[PDB]
Amino acid sequence: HTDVLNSTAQGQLKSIIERVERLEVEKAEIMEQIKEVYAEAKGNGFDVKVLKKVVRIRKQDRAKR
Amino acid sequence: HTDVLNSTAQGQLKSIIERVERLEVEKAEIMEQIKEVYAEAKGNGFDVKVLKKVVRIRKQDRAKR
Secondary structure, three states: OOOOOOHHHHHHHHHHHHHHHHHHHHHHHHHHHHHHHHHHHHHOOOOHHHHHHHHHHHHHHHHOO | OOOOOOHHHHHHHHHHHHHHHHHHHHHHHHHHHHHHHHHHHHHOOOOHHHHHHHHHHHHHHHHOO
16 A cells, blocks of 8 residues: 555665564564563562562552652 | 562562563663654654554564464
8 A cells, every 4th residue: 555655765664664673573582581581580489470560560650750 | 568588589589570670671772762763754754653553464464374
C-alpha cells in the first residue's frame, strides 16, 4: 500500500523500517539478558514471578513523584 | 516481606533486583532511540502509527515460521 511513493521516498521508508527493526533486535537481546538474571534468581531459590512483581512495584513507587 | 532471609540471602536478592533494574534502564534507552527513529520518520512525512503497525506485521509474518 505504498505505490504512491517514488523511489527516493520508498528508500527513506525502507531505511526507517530497517533501523526500527534493528533496534528491536537490540531490545530483544537486553530482554533475554533480563531473562537470564531472573533464571539465576530462580537458581538462588527466589520466586521469579514475585520478583517481577517487586521490580514493578519499585518502578511505580519511583514513578509516584 | 523478606525478613526470613539472612544477610547473605538478602544480599543476593538485592543484587538480582539491582541488576534487573539496570537492564531495564538499558531497555528504556533503546526504546527512546526507537522513539527518535519514529520521530524522524514523522519528519519524513510518514504516519508513525501506521509505521508501527507495519513493523508489527513484519514481526508476525516473520513469526509465522
